[PDB]
Every structure is written in C-alpha cells, then in structure tokens.
Structure 1
Amino acid sequence: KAPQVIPKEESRTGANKYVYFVCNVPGRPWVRLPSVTPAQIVTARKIKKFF
C-alpha cells in the first residue's frame, strides 16, 4: 500500500516553461522560485492561505 506521485517536469515543457524570480521590495536582490512537483504542489490547491 503506497500512493503514486506524479514526477516533476524537470524541463521547460509544461508548467515550468517560465522561470520565476521574486523580490520583496525593488532594490533588494531577487530570490529564485523553485520548480514545481505536480502532485504535491498543484493537487494541493484545495488549501487557500494568505501570503
């Protein structure tokens, strides 16, 4: 008994086509957003939380 996990799109083919950089205030250096595993991050869209 073990659930299956959909693996990451490690290339730039699917949802990871564009790389994302996040900075809080301009002037501060940008922080690279990591790549997205589908079944752990996007399937858990039933959460709804503040940033």
Structure 2
Amino acid sequence: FFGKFLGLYSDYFVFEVAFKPGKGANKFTYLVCSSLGGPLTRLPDVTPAQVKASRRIKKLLTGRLTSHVS
C-alpha cells in the first residue's frame, strides 16, 4: 500500500504490485481506486519527460483520471 492522494472531487487509494519497461523506475505497477473494493485501474508507465514536466508545476488532483493538467 503506497498511500492515499486527496483530490477535489474524489481520492486515490494506490497499491504497488510486482507481477511475478520492467526496471529502473518502472519496476513496479500501480493500481488506483476511488473507494476500497471498487474497480481498480492500472496506471501507465512513467516516462522521464513527464516526470521532468511535472517537476515544474504544482497542481491539485481533481480525482478524475481523464482530466487535463496544465
């Protein structure tokens, strides 16, 4: 269990799994849910571009995954 992220309209429970590209910072996979016991969603893999681009902003999560950022 990684933790919980608070959003504006919903929240994110985050689980970190290992599954029996696959190294560096993508060694683990992350599944998020809005409520415990609800349907899970796998997050994509991280790319250094979006890490570097998020390192320059400061945003509140909206609790919806299909939302714009900046």
Same fold (TM > 0.5): yes
Query: Which runs of 4 or more aligned residues in structure 1 lie more than 4 Å from their structure 2 counterparts after TM superposition?
Result: none
Matched residue pairs, number?
40
TM-score between both structures, scaled by the size of structure 2: 0.53
CA deviations over 1:6-50 (Å, ceiling 9, x no partner): xxxxx21111011000001012100110011112x1111111100
Structure (1 or 2) with the greater strand fraction: 2
TM-score between both structures, scaled by the size of structure 1: 0.70
Q: Choose 1 or 2 for highest CA Rg.
A: 1
Unaligned 5+ runs, structure 1: 1-10
The root-mean-square deviation of aligned C-alpha atoms, in Å, is 0.9
Unaligned 5+ runs, structure 2: 1-20, 62-70
Percent identity, please.
55
Greater relative contact order (Cα < 8 A, sep 6+): 1
